[PDB]
Design a protein around this ligand. Sequence first.
Ligand SMILES: O=C(Nc1cccc(Cl)c1)Nc1ncc(CCNc2ncnc3ccsc23)s1
Length: 256
Amino acid sequence: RQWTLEDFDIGRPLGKGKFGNVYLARERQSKFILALKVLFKTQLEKAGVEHQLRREVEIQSHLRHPNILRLYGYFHDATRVYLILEYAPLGTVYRELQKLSRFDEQRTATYITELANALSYCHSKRVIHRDIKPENLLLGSNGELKIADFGWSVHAPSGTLDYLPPEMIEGRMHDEKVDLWSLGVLCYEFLVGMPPFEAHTYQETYRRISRVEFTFPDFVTEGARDLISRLLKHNASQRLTLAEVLEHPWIKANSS
Ligand SMILES: O=C(Nc1cccc(Cl)c1)Nc1ncc(CCNc2ncnc3ccsc23)s1
């Protein structure tokens, strides 16, 4: 179907960045509710990202998983590009973490399981996400995690610095293990309420990631310390596999 903007009723903003806003939308004919992200062509070409966008759409025509948000298609006009997305009724994990401050051990491990299942599938098709962070994790109507925004994704091998591994911040070669590090940064932020290498400047953060300089607060349990520490390894190969995450005593104990 050759979609046009007139096929939709547009509703409230769902979110917004400086690439474009996301709006609630309803397809006029079916009454189907979805999300429309409105990207400006000027912004995309002035940043030379039009190719990464074209690849995202292409990657998202193949990926089908309950824990990956759907990109149903796209259409353009004179000035803007419109992405046709699955609506995530419970919003972002980013907003949920701001509200709750931090996540208990049970909801953390459940998210990490859902994220690990999504990434396991992605890594099978040789797709690496590279941009795992709370703002790209959204919540389905049953509170289930969905990974979103495949714009920075690539086939392996190939904002803030908080979630990026050493091999990536140092402009070097990298593979799947990128997502494995980001999963460990997430586990930590879920539990603590802030990411492990947080600093007030880009340059302090960069120093902390490459030297892997992080400490745990008192309340983090030994099983969680163990998971996170086996994930946040400078040497990519030493890290841990998704299968080792999913079969981890802490995940098994606490995941629902
Ligand atoms: O942005 C891109 N690609 C992109 C953008 C700019 C440049 C390039 Cl190169 C690529 N892709 C995305 N895929 C999913 C996205 C999530 C949109 N947000 C939401 N979607 C559904 N429900 C809710 C509810 C709360 S927010 C929200 S964004």
